[PDB]
């Protein structure tokens, strides 16, 4: 009775709602690509009779399919009617492909109720010939598939159009499959885009460089990136069930169909895409360094975007000149060092966002920081020569290198959470100290070329500036005591000059020597502490053959290096003069300040 009706429907249970389609190989090593809606083919209630007669198989027949009905339209409702349409057909289509040895769907009860059913009919026929029954099987079809038809829609037909109660053209089912898939596609591509709208909007307010939106665009291309897998496998088992051809331009067609020219071309992301789902003062400006105009255009790659630059979280190096850094906290394991003003005005950006552990995200984030960096130091330093602005590069390239590896000496607020991110990408669960440092150390062996890629876009004859691996592997402290040696004797040059103009002028009109020796004096005492701070380093970790795989510093006392690596110091011996409160040449003359 009505109870036993209850008895079919629970037999093949209820459907899942979700519509997805799952790969697998099949026995022969082929791979193919069934729909959730086939995999759910309504068949139990074929196991649970014993099929005694023809009669019987009919009766059951009917039962499946007006039973499959029932289910798809408790799957479908909420849906688009035409949806229900589609897949009352669809799995019509199956029903007989399936029963007439046409079917891709494998293992499960697909293969034990097909294996039953052709030794049923086995028994009925008496024909153990394959083929012969198949031929059977088909003329079986014919005589009762408008009746199985009629049936199976006979609860429904007012729930769907006229026309899709017109019983569906016979297809081969792989034809009838991608026709599916393609609709399903479209869909589902619809919806996932429009979530991407929703949430980007038009992407002018720096959307896209946000989980808000940074999400629908990469559940958008994940489900591309499937999709497309699907499609080649289907595409390719239509030509391979047609003699390796395209038969009837039926591939082909639904590509036109779509406006597209072919896979490729149908899943390229379009202009649209690349518009929302770009962050534009990170992965807009990297595309340009790697790929665009920046990449063989300095002038391109020197112009700077003041609003891209603010909204990654960086701005202008100041006029202003900050002094070295030797009373950080990062004195306390590693004390004599001094840091840099070009290090304490590093370019990291809103690092503490990067807090979801996405490699993707993290590396579009450092390329990010390494561009904006290499803009800045150009524009602060663009009057400067060639080799002087490629070491600049180099410096705060290899700063980078130290802080992604873990070995900075600073350790600040952004340079720390930066490392600590990088950990979250790693999501191996041995967390120790030295297991954590490896995976950051390799990572930065697999990306620092493209690092040094777009930060080397703003120097003119890029392949002038040489060795910017060999200069990263430098111990830190040791890269900054050169910068330090560089900058302290440029700096005193200009202050000697200062001495001579300012001299030239008095010696004709009017002439505060005192002053300004007194400002000088207070420089170059200040000069001498910081020197002598890392000075006392450099000799201490020399002694504890820290620099022993280091050439040109093994047993090289700490003024040596520095005349040494130090190009601007070339013309200087640290003598015990070096660091007098006035210049030898002008002793005398910031004394007697009476004149």
Same mark, same amino acid.
């Given at each position: 009775?009505?109870?036993?009706?209850?008895?079919?429907?629970?037999?093949?249970?209820?459907?899942?709602?979700?519509?997805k389609w799952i790969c697998r190989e099949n026995?022969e090593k082929i791979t193919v690509c069934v729909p959730?809606?086939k995999?759910? =083919?309504?068949?139990?209630?074929?196991?649970?009779?014993?099929?005694?007669?023809?009669?019987?198989?009919?009766?059951?027949?009917?039962?499946?399919?007006?039973?499959?009905?029932?289910?798809?339209?408790?799957? #479908? +409702?909420?849906?688009?009617?035409?949806?229900?349409?589609?897949?009352?057909?669809?799995?019509?289509?199956?029903?007989?492909?399936?029963?007439?040895?046409?079917?891709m769907d494998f293992?499960?009860?697909?293969?034990?109720?097909?294996?039953?059913?052709?030794?049923?009919?086995?028994?009925?026929?008496? *024909?153990?010939?394959?083929?012969?029954?198949?031929?059977?099987?088909?003329?079986?079809?014919?005589?009762?598939?408008?009746? =199985?038809?009629?049936?199976?829609?006979?609860?429904?037909?007012?729930?769907?159009?006229?026309?899709?109660?017109?019983?569906?053209? +016979?297809?081969?089912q792989i034809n009838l499959w991608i026709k599916e898939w393609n609709?399903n596609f =479209?869909? *589902?591509?619809?919806?996932?885009?429009?979530?991407?709208?929703?949430?980007?909007?038009? #992407?002018?307010?720096?959307?896209?460089? /946000?989980?808000?939106?940074?999400?629908?665009?990469?559940?958008?291309?994940?489900?591309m990136k499937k999709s497309k897998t699907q499609m080649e496998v289907l595409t390719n088992l239509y030509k391979k069930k047609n003699?390796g051809?395209?038969?009837?331009?039926?591939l082909?067609?639904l590509?036109?169909?779509?406006? $597209?020219?072919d896979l490729d071309?149908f899943f390229?992301?379009?202009?649209?895409?690349?518009?929302?789902?770009?962050?534009?003062?990170?992965?807009?400006?990297?595309?340009? /360094?790697? #790929?665009?105009?920046?990449?063989?255009?300095?002038?391109?790659?020197?112009?700077?975007?003041?609003?891209? =630059?603010?909204?990654?979280?960086?701005?202008? $190096?100041?006029?202003?000149?900050?002094?070295?850094?030797?009373?950080?906290?990062?004195?306390?394991?590693?004390?004599?060092?001094?840091?840099?003003?070009?290090?304490?005005?590093?370019?990291?950006?809103?690092?503490?966002?990067?807090?979801?552990?996405? +490699?993707?995200?993290?590396?579009?984030?450092?390329?990010?920081?390494?561009?904006?960096?290499?803009?800045?130091?150009?524009?602060?330093?663009?009057?400067?020569?060639?080799?002087?602005?490629?070491?600049?590069?180099?410096?705060?390239?290899?700063?980078?290198?130290?802080?992604?590896?873990?070995?900075?000496?600073?350790?600040?607020?952004?340079?720390?959470?930066?490392?600590?991110?990088?950990?979250?990408?790693?999501?191996?669960?041995?967390?120790?100290?030295?297991?954590?440092?490896?995976?950051?150390?390799?990572?930065?062996? +697999?990306?620092?070329?493209?690092?040094?890629?777009?930060?080397?876009?703003?120097?003119?004859?890029? *392949?002038?500036?040489?060795?910017?691996?060999?200069?990263?592997?430098?111990?830190?402290?040791?890269?900054?005591?050169?910068?330090?040696?560089?900058?302290?004797?440029?700096?005193?040059?200009?202050?000697?000059?200062?001495?001579?103009? /300012?001299?030239?002028?008095?010696? $004709?009109?009017?002439?505060?020597?005192?002053?300004?020796?007194?400002?000088?004096?207070?420089?170059?005492?200040?000069?001498?502490?910081?020197?002598?701070?890392?000075?006392?380093?450099?000799?201490?970790?020399?002694?504890?053959?820290?620099?022993?795989?280091?050439?040109?510093?093994?047993?090289? *006392?700490?003024?040596?290096?520095?005349?040494?690596?130090?190009?601007?110091?070339?013309?200087?011996?640290?003598?015990?003069?070096?660091? #007098?409160?006035?210049?030898?040449?002008?002793?005398?003359?910031?004394?007697?300040?009476?004149?």
């Amino acid at each position: 009775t009505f109870i036993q009706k209850r008895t079919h429907l629970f037999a093949c249970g209820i459907k899942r709602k979700s519509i997805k389609w799952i790969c697998r190989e099949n026995s022969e090593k082929i791979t193919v690509c069934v729909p959730d809606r086939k995999i759910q =083919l309504c068949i139990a209630n074929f196991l649970n009779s014993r099929l005694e007669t023809m009669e019987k198989f009919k009766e059951i027949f009917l039962i499946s399919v007006n039973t499959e009905a029932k289910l798809l339209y408790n799957k #479908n +409702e909420g849906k688009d009617p035409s949806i229900f349409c589609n897949e009352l057909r669809n799995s019509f289509s199956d029903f007989r492909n399936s029963f007439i040895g046409d079917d891709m769907d494998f293992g499960g009860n697909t293969d034990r109720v097909k294996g039953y059913i052709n030794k049923k009919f086995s028994d009925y026929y008496k *024909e153990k010939n394959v083929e012969k029954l198949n031929n059977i099987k088909k003329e079986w079809w014919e005589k009762n598939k408008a009746n =199985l038809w009629n049936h199976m829609i006979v609860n429904h037909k007012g729930n769907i159009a006229k026309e899709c109660a017109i019983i569906p053209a +016979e297809e081969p089912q792989i034809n009838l499959w991608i026709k599916e898939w393609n609709e399903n596609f =479209l869909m *589902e591509k619809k919806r996932l885009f429009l979530n991407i709208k929703d949430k980007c909007v038009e #992407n002018k307010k720096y959307e896209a460089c /946000f989980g808000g939106c940074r999400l629908p665009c990469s559940s958008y291309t994940s489900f591309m990136k499937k999709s497309k897998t699907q499609m080649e496998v289907l595409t390719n088992l239509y030509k391979k069930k047609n003699s390796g051809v395209d038969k009837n331009n039926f591939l082909n067609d639904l590509f036109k169909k779509n406006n $597209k020219n072919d896979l490729d071309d149908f899943f390229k992301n379009e202009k649209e895409y690349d518009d929302l789902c770009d962050c534009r003062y990170t992965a807009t400006i990297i595309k340009s /360094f790697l #790929n665009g105009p920046a990449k063989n255009d300095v002038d391109i790659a020197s112009q700077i975007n003041v609003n891209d =630059l603010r909204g990654f979280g960086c701005n202008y $190096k100041s006029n202003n000149e900050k002094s070295w850094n030797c009373a950080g906290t990062f004195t306390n394991k590693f004390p004599g060092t001094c840091e840099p003003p070009r290090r304490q005005t590093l370019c990291l950006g809103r690092t503490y966002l990067l807090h979801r552990g996405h +490699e993707e995200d993290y590396k579009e984030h450092l390329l990010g920081a390494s561009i904006y960096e290499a803009q800045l130091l150009k524009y602060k330093y663009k009057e400067k020569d060639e080799n002087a602005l490629c070491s600049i590069i180099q410096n705060s390239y290899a700063d980078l290198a130290d802080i992604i590896k873990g070995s900075d000496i600073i350790k600040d607020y952004y340079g720390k959470k930066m490392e600590e991110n990088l950990n979250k990408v790693n999501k191996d669960k041995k967390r120790n100290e030295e297991s954590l440092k490896i995976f950051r150390e390799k990572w930065w062996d +697999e990306n620092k070329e493209n690092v040094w890629k777009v930060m080397s876009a703003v120097l003119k004859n890029k *392949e002038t500036c040489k060795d910017y691996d060999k200069f990263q592997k430098i111990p830190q402290f040791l890269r900054w005591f050169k910068e330090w040696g560089d900058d302290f004797c440029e700096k005193r040059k200009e202050k000697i000059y200062s001495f001579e103009s /300012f001299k030239v002028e008095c010696k $004709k009109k009017d002439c505060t020597c005192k002053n300004k020796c007194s400002e000088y004096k207070k420089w170059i005492d200040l000069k001498k502490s910081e020197y002598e701070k890392q000075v006392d380093k450099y000799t201490k970790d020399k002694n504890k053959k820290m620099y022993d795989n280091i050439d040109e510093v093994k047993n090289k *006392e700490a003024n040596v290096y520095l005349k040494e690596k130090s190009k601007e110091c070339k013309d200087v011996n640290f003598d015990d003069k070096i660091f #007098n409160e006035a210049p030898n040449e002008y002793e005398d003359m910031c004394k007697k300040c009476d004149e």
